[PDB]
Amino acid sequence: KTHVQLSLPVLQVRDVLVRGFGDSVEEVLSEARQHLKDGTCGLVEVEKGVLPQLEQPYVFIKRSDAAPHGHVMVELVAELEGIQYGRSGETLGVLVPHVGEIPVAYRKVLLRK
């Protein structure tokens, strides 16, 4: 399928144990996509002081449309030293590996895969 219904666990930035997906824009987008497929991907909601606590390059999920079965359609945009790779809508959060942190909520998304 071109789209996949996911429920992403929302993690507090101070709980996150693995604070990014790797060391290049291509690697983090690759890794984010694999973890999203494997159900091992968390979401951190972006606010003042969150991004400096995570590792660049960043992977964002961004709203791609204005929401089937409650799932907001999203796509991936990466960011390194203030340059973004991809063009999309509003940020829903920054993706990180999920290694068993307890979530505060779930974000239902329909991921363009």
CA dist., res. 58 & res. 39, Å (int): 19
User: Would you list the DSSP string of the chain?
Assistant: --EEEEEEEE--GGG-SS--S-SSHHHHHHHHHHHHHHT-EEEE---TTTGGGSPSSEEEEEE----GGG-EEEEEEEEETTEEES--S-EEEEEEE-SSPPPSEEEEEEEE-
Q: What does the domain layout of the chain look like in residue ranges?
A: 3-112
State both tokens at 13.
Answer: 């930035």
Experimental approach taken:
X-ray
Please state which CATH number belongs to domain 3-112.
2.30.30
CA dist., res. 107 & res. 92, Å (int): 9
Give the count of beta carbons closer than 10 Å to the beta carbon of residue 41.
23
